[PDB]
Design an enzyme around this catalytic site. Structure first.
Site, short mmCIF file in Angstrom:
data_model
loop_
_atom_site.label_atom_id
_atom_site.label_comp_id
_atom_site.label_asym_id
_atom_site.label_seq_id
_atom_site.Cartn_x
_atom_site.Cartn_y
_atom_site.Cartn_z
N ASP A 114 6.81 8.00 5.30
CA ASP A 114 6.30 8.19 3.97
C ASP A 114 5.02 9.04 4.15
O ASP A 114 4.88 9.91 2.98
CB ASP A 114 5.77 6.90 3.56
CG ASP A 114 6.98 5.90 3.18
OD1 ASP A 114 8.14 6.51 3.04
OD2 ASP A 114 6.99 4.75 3.32
N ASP A 151 4.05 4.41 7.39
CA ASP A 151 5.39 3.77 6.72
C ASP A 151 5.11 2.84 5.99
O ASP A 151 4.49 1.59 6.62
CB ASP A 151 6.77 3.67 7.64
CG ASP A 151 7.94 4.27 6.94
OD1 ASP A 151 7.80 5.14 6.18
OD2 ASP A 151 9.03 3.79 7.57
N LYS A 173 6.30 -0.60 4.02
CA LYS A 173 7.41 -1.38 4.14
C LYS A 173 7.21 -2.78 3.04
O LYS A 173 6.31 -3.32 2.93
CB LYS A 173 8.01 -2.17 5.21
CG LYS A 173 7.98 -1.13 6.60
CD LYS A 173 8.87 0.18 6.08
CE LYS A 173 9.96 0.29 7.15
NZ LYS A 173 10.69 1.31 6.80
#
Lengths: 244, 244
Positions: free
Chosen positions: A73, A89, A91
């Site tokens: 990301d 990232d 999540k």
DNA sequence: AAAGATATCTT
DNA sequence: AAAGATATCTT
């Protein structure tokens, strides 16, 4: 550090604000749905400014994928150190009650971890860290969220699509498990534990070298895994056997 | 009709309103991302109140999935016609330059279309219609100004992640094509054509029965389709020979 | 659990 | 195109 400043900002931003809708250019507000499909998107967008703020303060450039379906990301890096890249990232997962065990899908095990340039913004070997920002929200019992629109003065009338949200920042390897997170989309699976264990980093791997070797040689089906390894114990036996 | 009114309102709302970002309870606004995972979510949330309004006007009940992995997005029905439910699914795709050819993923071909109660809110045989609300946006790259938070007074300053959103309303079977929309997740593929083709319904199937027969007997891989059928011409020849 | 669902995209 | 990527859930 960058990591400690990012962790602090994340907890504080989470403590302070609560997202409640999408706003149009006319000032019309549309409420948020109750599923992870909606909430992962929202938690992603929420974190953007925070990451960007903290990274700039530390002198790191922030880059998002130019191609959809490319990890991670956010890519943080200083221009003077191109091989010291940090991958972040975001999540998300849910709980039905506050103190239940959770688990995350931690990315594919057949893409960039087996192929340096596959589905990743920069070659995998330029990253020195892979961080997971995990959001855990408790689902609202209500399965019929508002079907009307709101104006700016009615902000506090908009039903929140969660009971509570918790956030953590942790290295991928540290919270990685030994059972796949998905089947047909072959995702690494995280540990299955309470929120506390993710924060504390109570994993099962002895090191990142072991996490990556495990996932790099994990077979895709039960049938193929049954003659190799299906878990960490079987994997360590596999190593003793001579990787065969 | 319900259908003419629904499309008129979607089309009207599309041409007057534009989503800008997520707003918090405290009034902070967070800019939107530039990809389909974000925009599909937004267009789903944007459409919810419109669908409810028009449905209410025709005496229809609107029900959303109670479980996450379930089609369709919206189930419309009158209590006086329980076996005449209407399924509505919102799909989004992008274009890099206004008016290029587009394609959508139209749901699995191995779930509810082969098993009456697999991954569907109500038994598939209770639905007499399956509509697709399709959104097409022209992608616009992210810039510096979307990485910070905004206040309510700067609503109009926030940079939009898209350009020229277009919307259509059509039957699934009508815009259905003869090539899979995805591999490992086995989805029906739509036609690959211009926006006007979708609106006008220039698909490849002659009837909804043919759509269903094709996708119900379509094999999952090229290897298995080599001996059966890979496209509509092959399918029709297969049919002509006696399904062999 | 393992396997395959949910929506869509890239190469 | 076909095949397997992107995230996560169900069962």
């Amino acid at each position: 550090s960058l990591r400690s400043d990012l962790i602090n900002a994340l907890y504080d931003e989470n403590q302070k604000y609560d997202v409640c809708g999408i706003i149009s250019a006319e000032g019309k507000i549309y409420p948020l749905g109750s599923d992870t499909k909606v909430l992962s998107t929202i938690f992603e967008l929420f974190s953007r400014p925070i990451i960007n703020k903290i990274a700039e303060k530390h002198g790191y450039i922030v880059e998002e994928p130019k191609q959809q379906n490319h990890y991670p990301d956010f890519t943080l890096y200083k221009p003077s150190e191109p091989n010291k890249k940090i991958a972040i990232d975001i999540k998300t997962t849910y709980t039905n009650k506050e103190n239940e065990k959770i688990k995350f899908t931690l990315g594919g095990y057949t893409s960039f971890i087996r192929n340096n340039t596959k589905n990743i913004v920069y070659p995998f070997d330029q990253y020195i860290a892979h961080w997971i920002i995990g959001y855990v929200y408790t689902r609202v019992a209500t399965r019929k969220s508002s079907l009307k629109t709101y104006n700016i003065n009615e902000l506090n009338e908009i039903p929140k699509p969660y009971k509570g949200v918790k956030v953590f920042l942790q290295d991928k390897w540290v919270i990685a498990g030994d059972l796949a997170g998905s089947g047909n989309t072959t995702n690494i699976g995280s540990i299955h534990a309470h929120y506390k264990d993710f924060v504390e980093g109570k994993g099962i791997f002895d090191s990142e070298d072991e996490f990556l070797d495990y996932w790099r040689n994990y077979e895709r089906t039960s049938q193929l895994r049954n003659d190799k390894y299906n878990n960490i114990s079987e994997y360590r036996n596999w190593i003793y056997r001579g990787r065969k």
